Amino acid sequence: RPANHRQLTFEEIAKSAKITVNEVELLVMKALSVGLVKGSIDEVDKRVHMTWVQPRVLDLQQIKGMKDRLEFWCTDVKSMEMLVEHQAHDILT
Amino acid sequence: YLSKIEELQLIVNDKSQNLRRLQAQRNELNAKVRLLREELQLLQEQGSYVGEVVRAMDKKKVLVKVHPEGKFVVDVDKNIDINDV
Amino acid sequence: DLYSRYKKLQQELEFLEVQEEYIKDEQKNLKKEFLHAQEEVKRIQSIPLVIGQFLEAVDQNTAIVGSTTGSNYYVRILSTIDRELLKPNASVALHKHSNALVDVLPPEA
Amino acid sequence: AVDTAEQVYISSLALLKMLKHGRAGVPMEVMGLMLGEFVDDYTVRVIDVFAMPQSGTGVSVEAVDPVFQAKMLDMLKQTGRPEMVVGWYHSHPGFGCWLSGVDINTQQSFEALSERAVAVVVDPIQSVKGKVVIDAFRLINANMMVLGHEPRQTTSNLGHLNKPSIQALIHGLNRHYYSITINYRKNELEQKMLLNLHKKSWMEGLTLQDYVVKEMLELAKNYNKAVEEEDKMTPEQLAIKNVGKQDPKRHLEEHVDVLMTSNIVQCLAAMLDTVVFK
Amino acid sequence: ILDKKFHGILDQGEGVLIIFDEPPVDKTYEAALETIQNMSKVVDSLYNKAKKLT
Amino acid sequence: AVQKVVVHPLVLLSVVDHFNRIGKVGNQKRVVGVLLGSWQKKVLDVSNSFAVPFDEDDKDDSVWFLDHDYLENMYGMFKKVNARERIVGWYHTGPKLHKNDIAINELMKRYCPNSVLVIIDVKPKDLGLPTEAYISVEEVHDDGTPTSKTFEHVTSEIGAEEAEEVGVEHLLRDIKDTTVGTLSQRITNQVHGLKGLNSKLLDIRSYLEKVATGKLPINHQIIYQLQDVFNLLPDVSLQEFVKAFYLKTNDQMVVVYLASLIRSVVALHNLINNKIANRDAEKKEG
Amino acid sequence: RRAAVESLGFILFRTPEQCPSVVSLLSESYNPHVRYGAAMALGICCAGTGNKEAINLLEPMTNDPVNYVRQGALIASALIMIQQTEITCPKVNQFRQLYSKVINDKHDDVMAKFGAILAQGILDAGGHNVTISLQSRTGHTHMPSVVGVLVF
Numbered sequence A: 001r002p003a004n005h006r007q008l009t010f011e012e013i014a015k016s017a018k019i020t021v022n023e024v025e026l027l028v029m030k031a032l033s034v035g036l037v038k039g040s041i042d043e044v045d046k047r048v049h050m051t052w053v054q055p056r057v058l059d060l061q062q063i064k065g066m067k068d069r070l071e072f073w074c075t076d077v078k079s080m081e082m083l084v085e086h087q088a089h090d091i092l093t
Numbered sequence B: 001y002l003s004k005i006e007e008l009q010l011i012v013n014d015k016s017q018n019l020r021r022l023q024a025q026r027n028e029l030n031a032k033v034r035l036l037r038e039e040l041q042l043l044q045e046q047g048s049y050v051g052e053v054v055r056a057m058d059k060k061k062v063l064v065k066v067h068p069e070g071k072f073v074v075d076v077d078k079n080i081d082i083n084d085v
Numbered sequence C: 001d002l003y004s005r006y007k008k009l010q011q012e013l014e015f016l017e018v019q020e021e022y023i024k025d026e027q028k029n030l031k032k033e034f035l036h037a038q039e040e041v042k043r044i045q046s047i048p049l050v051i052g053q054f055l056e057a058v059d060q061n062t063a064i065v066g067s068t069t070g071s072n073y074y075v076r077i078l079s080t081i082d083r084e085l086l087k088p089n090a091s092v093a094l095h096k097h098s099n100a101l102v103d104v105l106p107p108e109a
Numbered sequence D: 001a002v003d004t005a006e007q008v009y010i011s012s013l014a015l016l017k018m019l020k021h022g023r024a025g026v027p028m029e030v031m032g033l034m035l036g037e038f039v040d041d042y043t044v045r046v047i048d049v050f051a052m053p054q055s056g057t058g059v060s061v062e063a064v065d066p067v068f069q070a071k072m073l074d075m076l077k078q079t080g081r082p083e084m085v086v087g088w089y090h091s092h093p094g095f096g097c098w099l100s101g102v103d104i105n106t107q108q109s110f111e112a113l114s115e116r117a118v119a120v121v122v123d124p125i126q127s128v129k130g131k132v133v134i135d136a137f138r139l140i141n142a143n144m145m146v147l148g149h150e151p152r153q154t155t156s157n158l159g160h161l162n163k164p165s166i167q168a169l170i171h172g173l174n175r176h177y178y179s180i181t182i183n184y185r186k187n188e189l190e191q192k193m194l195l196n197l198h199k200k201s202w203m204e205g206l207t208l209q210d211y212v213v214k215e216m217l218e219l220a221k222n223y224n225k226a227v228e229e230e231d232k233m234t235p236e237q238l239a240i241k242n243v244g245k246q247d248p249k250r251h252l253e254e255h256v257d258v259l260m261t262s263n264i265v266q267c268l269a270a271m272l273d274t275v276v277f278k
Numbered sequence E: 001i002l003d004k005k006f007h008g009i010l011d012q013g014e015g016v017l018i019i020f021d022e023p024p025v026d027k028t029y030e031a032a033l034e035t036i037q038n039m040s041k042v043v044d045s046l047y048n049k050a051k052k053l054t
Numbered sequence F: 001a002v003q004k005v006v007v008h009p010l011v012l013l014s015v016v017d018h019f020n021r022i023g024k025v026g027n028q029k030r031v032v033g034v035l036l037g038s039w040q041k042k043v044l045d046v047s048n049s050f051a052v053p054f055d056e057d058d059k060d061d062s063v064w065f066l067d068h069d070y071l072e073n074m075y076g077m078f079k080k081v082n083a084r085e086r087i088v089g090w091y092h093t094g095p096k097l098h099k100n101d102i103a104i105n106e107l108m109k110r111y112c113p114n115s116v117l118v119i120i121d122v123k124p125k126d127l128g129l130p131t132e133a134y135i136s137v138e139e140v141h142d143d144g145t146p147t148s149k150t151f152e153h154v155t156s157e158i159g160a161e162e163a164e165e166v167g168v169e170h171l172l173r174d175i176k177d178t179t180v181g182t183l184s185q186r187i188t189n190q191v192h193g194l195k196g197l198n199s200k201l202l203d204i205r206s207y208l209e210k211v212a213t214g215k216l217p218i219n220h221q222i223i224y225q226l227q228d229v230f231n232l233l234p235d236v237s238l239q240e241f242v243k244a245f246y247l248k249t250n251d252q253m254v255v256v257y258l259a260s261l262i263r264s265v266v267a268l269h270n271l272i273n274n275k276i277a278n279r280d281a282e283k284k285e286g
Numbered sequence G: 001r002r003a004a005v006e007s008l009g010f011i012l013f014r015t016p017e018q019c020p021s022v023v024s025l026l027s028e029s030y031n032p033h034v035r036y037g038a039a040m041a042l043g044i045c046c047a048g049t050g051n052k053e054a055i056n057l058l059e060p061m062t063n064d065p066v067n068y069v070r071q072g073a074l075i076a077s078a079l080i081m082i083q084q085t086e087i088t089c090p091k092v093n094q095f096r097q098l099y100s101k102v103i104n105d106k107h108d109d110v111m112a113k114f115g116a117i118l119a120q121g122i123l124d125a126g127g128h129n130v131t132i133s134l135q136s137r138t139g140h141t142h143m144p145s146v147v148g149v150l151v152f
């Protein structure tokens, strides 16, 4: 899922997990005890919270995530580093 | 009558001169601050020994007994008289 | 002479405004030089300093110092040490070649 | 014959081997050799200085094994390019310098063998990055005493070599000696790269790895209270009267630059989120 | 809570009654105590300043 | 085994001087030499090295020549003058690796089991870091070949030693230690930002070149597995630190209140001394 | 740096009346180079001036701690005192007996007293008949008085 939704619902868990609405707490606490993810779940509304995870490749040879995040970030911090230079133009003097 | 009074206006220019002269004085301040710091090689030297002058003798020398050691007839510097030794 | 006086006042002005920049740069330089003076002289630290004794100062910063080699010497002390740490004495820290007063050891108490 | 101011261009490898070989030569005053090129009378560039094995008897020319030289330089024959052994070096690794008796042991030997035969006196103590502590000289004949010993054709470098006001035992032994100039030649390809690898190594942070940001500000607000009240307590007792007394005790209170630079660091390191992030 | 304290503010609807404060903040206090006397010095110097001129 | 080192630039000039040996006479144009190492700790240490007379041909690229008197008994003379220094590895130029590397690896491992070679550069105008360090282990592959001695990399670093810059830093004179606040960190800013995201532009560029025609990093899946370690932050279309909204507010909080309070007190430092000192020394007319 | 403080009178001898105010703290540099070239700068700059400020500033330059800047300051005293007569500045005979002081004693610096009699000869070039001439009546500058002095 294309993040920025990490604290979320439970019906997609009870739908894709082929589990019920009730048995998601066993699910999340046992999955934390396994050791593939380490985020302490917001349990009051069955709201997920996640950490480090193991990947299975992105867009078909990692086109889209790589471009629109990696190179977007490249030109982000690169060009705003040029802006750091632009305001720090002669503070080296 | 433009080309008369611009010359007078060129003393706003001369305000930079006073500031120039005075920061030249400011540099002249640090010049002997740095000379005081350059002086400190004299601190970097072995100073001297103490000595027991028992009694002087003729012909512009004295005797000196060093603190654990024996006596040593030694020579003087240019700044000291045997009348004062 | 209003074509040549007004010519050359500008000239001597631009001269002195160039000549200001030299001393502006030297004032930039010598503060760095004085900092290099500060720290690169104050590396005079504890190269394994010896314990001795302090006896006399003829004036400001020129000592007469006894040692735990027993004898008595005649050196100068730095521009750093406070003059009310040696007030009859101290357990003192001395260099070796320069053999000058560096520091006050903690007394026995 | 005629005399003109001799110049010692040094290889910077020689500087490194002198400091290292005398550093390992811990107090026991090691001996090594100098291996160089005969350009003229008034200059010498040394190109190679290698190591000689430690002898615990007495620092001598008789410890110089010539077949050790033959074998070592034999390995060095096809290795790069060999040259003439043009001198030697001993060590006084704690104190500055003096003109040893080891000089008058081996110097006549190497001025018999070689021609320029430069004595070399060394010390590592006097600094770590900013001095020229090594010292070098050369024995004078007794036969030139009919000549008065004041010709020198380029007296800028004797006006730079006499200029440091020569210290103790050198002019205790002005006789049997005459000095020699030792500059550091053009070594810029190494100079710039050790400048790089000094403010890239010998100052911490390999620049990917600096951008302590906060706990230093906890300790620094401890600083900026504890330093502050002492900056407060003192200038109350400034010359609040009309006295014309002129005798200061000097303590120069001010404490400005700590605040200044530390808080520029704090603000531009609080910038790190908006800087490195987006 | 009234007369004495252990700085327990009335936390009616939480369930802990959280007992909290940060007593070392006194860099700001100390700077205030500085300013109060720093300009006592300055005001004492102003007499010289506006006296020795005219 | 070998993890990080302590290396002093005497080896660096011991590279550059043999570069002066074979540069003007340049026929095989390469400086390949032996790295003596005072192996003290798990951290390595070097204070000596020598360059072997050596060649390396292109055809079949496995013809190469040591000098085993210069390798054995020169090392023995060195062991006599310094037994603390012993062998730890070697070094070469030509940072493009090749096929003879594994052969001199085969011979460097019999002198020292956890050996390490050094890829150098003769002109680093780099970001920069100095010369390289490897580690030779056998992981063979997922392939089933006879033993694959593929060069694994040790993270290289530099140490220090007393009294080894005495004339050199004296000659440069451009030494400026205490100026962090204007320049010494903006250099790092320019450096890690631009030079890390352009190495990352080589990452996207090289790996999209693998997408087009290349390895397409399968079977070393640690590539995108570690781009997931990058992808701790996904930053999806609102850049997603609106949970760090108040956290960044509370971060701006502390330092900007420090800024306001402390710099007002910094004014209270500057102004009073400046005005009093100036008014005194100015109204003293003579 | 020495060449930079040597080029000054070479480019500014049409107006020698600014050199004291601009080489003033240059006479108080760190090295023998800029101090030496500073003495020479006031020397080759203010040749025909009846200035005596250049003289007054060469006074702590001829009493400097560095030896061959005292040499070069005697030579700069020769430079200021030519295109100058006795009554142009009252220290001409003071510098004659001052050269005499420093050279006719032995205990002063040999390298720093070499300049004294050579500077006397500069001062008595033809018995003040002949002197240096950077600036003609025509304004055509003279090639010995530029080229020879820069090599000198």
Ligand SMILES: [Zn+2]
Pocket (backbone or CB within 6 Å): D029, D090, D091, D092, D100
């Ligand atoms: Zn020795």
